[PDB]
Design a protein around this nucleic acid. Structure first.
Ligand SMILES: [Mg+2]
Ligand SMILES: [Mg+2]
Ligand SMILES: [Mg+2]
Ligand SMILES: [Mg+2]
Ligand SMILES: [Mg+2]
Ligand SMILES: [Mg+2]
Ligand SMILES: [Mg+2]
Ligand SMILES: [Mg+2]
Ligand SMILES: [Mg+2]
Ligand SMILES: [Mg+2]
Lengths: 100, 61, 135, 149, 141, 65, 214
RNA sequence: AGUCCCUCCCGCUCGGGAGGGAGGCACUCUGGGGGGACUGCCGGCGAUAAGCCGGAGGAAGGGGCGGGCGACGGUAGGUCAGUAUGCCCCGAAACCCCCGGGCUACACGCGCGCUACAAUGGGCGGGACAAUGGGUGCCGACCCCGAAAGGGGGAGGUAAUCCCCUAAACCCGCCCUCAGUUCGGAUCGCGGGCUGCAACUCGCCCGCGUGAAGCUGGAAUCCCUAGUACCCGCGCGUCAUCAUCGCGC
């Protein structure tokens, strides 16, 4: 009777906007929602040699990509379920919903 | 086929194994059972060193 | 039924201590503090209690849970937590004054951490480098 | 008194001495000729190392059960000298630990939890705790501070 | 009783050493194999070698004659699966030396790669030879 | 045979080939010339109030700028 | 071997290693008096928080100074008694526990052999091993000459400790004597002005060279 | 952690421990927002300016500490064998495939390292404490077989959930006692395995045996200012198999 929502994006602000929209949807209805839980960030780190050839001193680049995550639990209410089913997320945010 | 294993039924024959540029003759003896053919066809020539040339020592450069 | 909790940190070691009224029993991860080895580690934990005195020592029971770091790092974190718990429990500033004179770090902690490594012989350290040759 | 109240090595010594009275604990037939792991170099020197190993395994199961063969193998590994190459860590073998656990189960000291490993039975818990209590009674004669615990 | 010199299997053993370490003077016997034979014979490996009796020496030599028949595992002997008879054997001193020489001679007769490497006095098990393995004198330019 | 103690009262400046020596003014505390103020050369870190043990008290270092 | 009363030792008073009190130890030399710290303290391990500030080593207990001094290899890039001593991977670098044990056993031996407080003997030794005059080098015409100068007290203390440690290290290198015994022997010899002490002989040589070049 | 319930141990239980279930967000942690340090306060030097030196309080004091970002130009410095591209050449071979060799040779000179030359140790038994990262062509707990390397089944995991994952240096007890040795483990013999279409040239692992030089290093010369240097192991990259390497912990 509860739904679990997982959010992930490479931009923090869009994630915050989507979470706030879900929070307000839950607020405008009588329904209990466990707050957005922040899960640990994913860091993808790649270290590469800079020069194309092998002459000279060795210097390195450290490229990094960060992926943020959030977790939200809400109880399945059809009046509130339709609203979150129709909210539109930006193209740089991934959302997945499941019933437990 | 340099990686063929010598078998007992091969004893008594003569086989020419490629060594990179030519086929060398091998006469199979009974004590060769269990070895690869390539073990009897060397691929490199023995080394007989000449006089060290310019750049072989610190003072020769 | 007073219960007081305190925390201590030392280079990736974390210690959480609970102090209450008791008979004088102190345990580190369940082991009596008198059986802690080696000796240099045991003396690190016992200093705040010895400074406090025998009367205070025999009137309280302390239980400490510590994780992370090494055997010397865990001893110091437990020492910090025990000192903070002692000063907060009895709440007298004469004891607090005595601790600062003997060792300031007992109450303020140690903020040192490892420095990240850099290229040119990265595995050895941030500043160690490969031997240089010219010919 | 419990296991947590005494030093580990002294308790292992006492338990090893006591375990020789149990008819179900017997070294296997290949015991005289083997090393205790690929990282070792020479055979064990004590003529009764089997009982020491069994006692150590029993105390290990008491504290960290349920636990299986692989984790115990990790526990009994160590550093190996590799000639001209740098030293490295390696695990231990499997036959010794498996045989010891089977003998302990036959003696009624441990039991098997499916999919999880082996845990200590009440009989074995009493067996260890009684020896620990005796050792602590002896120990506090020379360390008066242990009477509080 | 105590003897400062004891001869076993044609080798004179120190009497002040422990038996396990004393027996290692025999070529073909290491520390592990010595401990095995000591345990099989029913002798404390830590006893002095100088307290041995004649019957014990006879027993030890008999064990060294055919260890497998006396309960030593087949994976512990120094020549398992013999090339001629096919049995599991343990060899010591002159017989060991002549067996090794015979193996190398067999490799040499069939003109195998390892035989040539043995003949030329060069590394046999695939080492690099450009940098190390240098034994000689500097050549000038 | 035991030297004479002196007390540093003023620091003048660094000197020496590699800046390893400091020039100081000291006051003799004991002996024939007790109370006199003379300048000396010292090797090692030093501050006002330290006490030196002079083996003799008749040599005076040349003034530096 | 070691009695259980010693393996599990519980102190109850603030004293050095819980075994020796420094209440009656006196320093005769007026120059070294303010630089030999003798405040009461149980565990001599300050975790190296003093090296940051200038003159910070003044307020560090002398026993910890000795422990840090012997926590080394000994002969890395100059010869001691005619030999390099490169311990390498079997040295006492960063192993402060082993150095602690070595110093403790050395103190036990010292107290047993002489019947006095070990800290007092150590103080006497460092007093006897500290030089009072040194020299600096000048270059003229491609030749190196010496000029005599004076030594500040802190450098005196540092040199004394280093020489004691070096002598102890040299006495136990590839011999049958152990490190603790060598340290005790070196301290005892230096306390009695015996010429067989490495530190005392080094001090005599330094002072002679400085004197002969005023 | 405090509170409740059930079960099991001990000195027989006044007391003291361990699991499990309810229950909670206290503490740790995770991640968004915010505060905090400014030569702001005090005393000197300097000019009364710019600043400098020394103290108080403070988690932190004077670019707070560690990184990223390298101006106009030069070096005919390296790279057309990463990719793009002018000219010149081959254009039925200098283009495209397949099999076998080589880059791994070896009187010798040199760079960077690993292991040692032993007691500031070697061996055997026992006792302690991590972090960074990675996993579906994969990580694999748990059970069984084998002395070891390994073999046969196989839960859970698309992961703060399951796994790699109970590190070593360190501590306790016994043997060895200054010796080319119970130091060192190069070199070689016999046997057992794994990856792979293929292991001889030319792979890695295990058992027994064998036991080289080396007893501290000339003239010269390198790195490093604090959680730094020294000592100790681990993760990832490369990768079917293979780490004395690079980058990190
Ligand atoms: Mg580091
Ligand atoms: Mg272990
Ligand atoms: Mg080693
Ligand atoms: Mg150019
Ligand atoms: Mg050019
Ligand atoms: Mg090449
Ligand atoms: Mg080339
Ligand atoms: Mg050895
Ligand atoms: Mg091959
Ligand atoms: Mg030697």
């Amino acid at each position: 009777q509860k739904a679990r929502i997982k959010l992930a994006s490479t931009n923090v602000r869009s994630l915050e906007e989507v979470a706030n929209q879900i929070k307000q949807i839950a607020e405008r209805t009588g329904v209990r929602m466990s707050g957005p839980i922040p899960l640990p960030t994913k860091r993808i780190r790649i270290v590469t040699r800079k020069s194309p050839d092998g002459e000279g001193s060795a210097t390195f680049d450290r490229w990094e990509l960060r992926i943020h995550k959030r977790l939200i639990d809400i109880e399945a209410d059809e009046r509130a379920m339709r609203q979150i089913m129709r909210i539109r997320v930006p193209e740089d945010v991934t959302i997945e919903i499941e019933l437990i | 086929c340099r990686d063929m294993i010598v078998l007992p039924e091969m004893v008594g024959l003569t086989i020419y194994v490629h060594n990179g540029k030519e086929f060398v003759p091998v006469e199979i003896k009974p004590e060769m059972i269990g070895h690869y053919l390539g073990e009897f066809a060397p691929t490199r020539k023995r080394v007989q060193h000449g006089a060290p040339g310019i750049g072989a020592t610190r003072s020769s450069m | 039924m007073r219960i007081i909790q305190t925390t201590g940190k030392r280079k990736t070691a974390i210690a959480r201590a609970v102090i209450r009224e008791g008979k004088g029993r102190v345990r580190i991860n369940g082991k009596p503090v008198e059986l802690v080895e080696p000796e240099i580690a045991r003396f690190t934990i016992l200093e705040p209690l010895i400074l406090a005195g025998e009367e205070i020592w025999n009137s309280v029971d302390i239980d400490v849970k510590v994780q992370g770091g090494g055997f010397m790092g865990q001893a110091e974190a437990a020492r910090i937590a025990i000192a903070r718990a002692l000063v907060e429990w009895t709440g007298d500033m004469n004891l607090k004054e005595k601790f600062i004179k003997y060792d300031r770090t007992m109450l303020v902690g140690d903020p040192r951490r490892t420095e990240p490594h850099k290229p040119n012989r990265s595995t050895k350290g941030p500043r160690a480098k490969r031997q240089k040759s010219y010919r | 008194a419990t296991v947590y109240d005494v030093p580990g090595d002294l308790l292992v010594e006492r338990v090893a001495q006591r375990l020789k009275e149990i008819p179900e604990i017997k070294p296997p037939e290949w015991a005289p000729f083997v090393k205790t792991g690929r990282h070792k170099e020479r055979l064990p020197e004590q003529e009764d190392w089997w009982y020491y190993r069994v006692a150590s395994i029993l105390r290990r199961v008491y504290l960290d059960g349920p636990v299986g063969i692989e984790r115990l193998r990790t526990y009994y590994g160590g550093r190996k000298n590799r000639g001209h190459a740098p030293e490295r860590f390696y695990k231990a073998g499997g036959s010794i630990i498996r045989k010891a656990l089977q003998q302990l189960e036959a003696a009624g000291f441990v039991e098997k939890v499916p999919g999880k490993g082996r845990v200590i039975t009440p009989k074995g818990r009493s067996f260890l705790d009684k020896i620990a209590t005796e050792l602590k009674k002896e120990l506090e004669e020379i360390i008066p501070e242990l009477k509080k615990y | 009783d105590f003897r400062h010199i004891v001869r076993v299997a044609g080798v004179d053993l120190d009497g002040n050493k422990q038996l396990r370490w004393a027996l290692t003077a025999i070529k073909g016997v290491g520390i592990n194999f010595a401990t095995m034979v000591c345990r099989v014979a029913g002798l404390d490996p830590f006893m002095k070698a100088g307290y041995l009796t004649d019957e014990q020496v006879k027993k030890i030599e008999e064990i060294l004659q055919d260890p497998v028949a006396h309960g030593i595992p087949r994976w512990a002997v120094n020549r398992p699966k013999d090339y001629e008879t096919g049995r599991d054997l343990h060899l010591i001193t002159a017989k060991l030396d002549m067996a090794i020489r015979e193996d190398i001679m067999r490799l040499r007769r069939i003109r195998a790669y390892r035989g040539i490497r043995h003949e030329l006095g060069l590394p046999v098990r695939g080492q690099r030879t450009r940098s190390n393995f240098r034994r000689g004198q500097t050549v000038g330019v | 045979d035991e030297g004479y103690p002196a007390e540093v009262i003023e620091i003048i400046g660094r000197t020496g080939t590699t800046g390893d020596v400091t020039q100081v003014k000291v006051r003799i505390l004991e002996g024939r010339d007790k109370g006199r103020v003379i300048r000396r050369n010292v090797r090692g870190p030093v501050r006002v109030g330290d006490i030196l043990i002079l083996r003799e008290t008749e040599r005076e270092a040349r003034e530096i700028k | 071997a070691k009695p259980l009363s010693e393996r599990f030792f519980i102190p109850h008073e603030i004293k050095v290693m819980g075994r020796w009190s420094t209440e009656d130890v006196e320093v005769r030399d007026p120059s070294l008096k303010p630089y030999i710290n003798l405040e009461p303290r149980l565990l001599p391990h300050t975790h190296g928080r003093h090296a940051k500030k200038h003159f910070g080593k003044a307020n560090v207990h002398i026993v910890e100074r000795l422990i840090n001094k012997i926590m080394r290899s000994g002969g890395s890039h100059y010869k001691v008694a005619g030999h390099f001593m490169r311990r390498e991977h079997r040295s006492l670098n960063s192993k402060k526990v082993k150095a602690y044990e070595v110093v403790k056993e050395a103190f036990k031996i010292i107290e047993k052999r002489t019947g006095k407080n070990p800290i007092q003997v150590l103080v006497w030794a460092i007093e006897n091993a500290a030089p009072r005059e040194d020299t600096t080098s000048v270059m003229f015409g491609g030749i190196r000459y010496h000029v005599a100068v004076d030594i500040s007290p802190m450098r005196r203390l540092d040199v004394a400790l280093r020489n004691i440690a070096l002598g102890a290290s040299a006495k136990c290198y590839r011999t049958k004597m152990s490190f603790a015994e060598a340290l005790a022997e070196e301290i005892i010899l230096a306390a009695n002005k015996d010429p067989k002490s490495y530190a005392y002989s080094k001090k005599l040589e330094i002072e002679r060279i400085a004197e002969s070049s005023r």
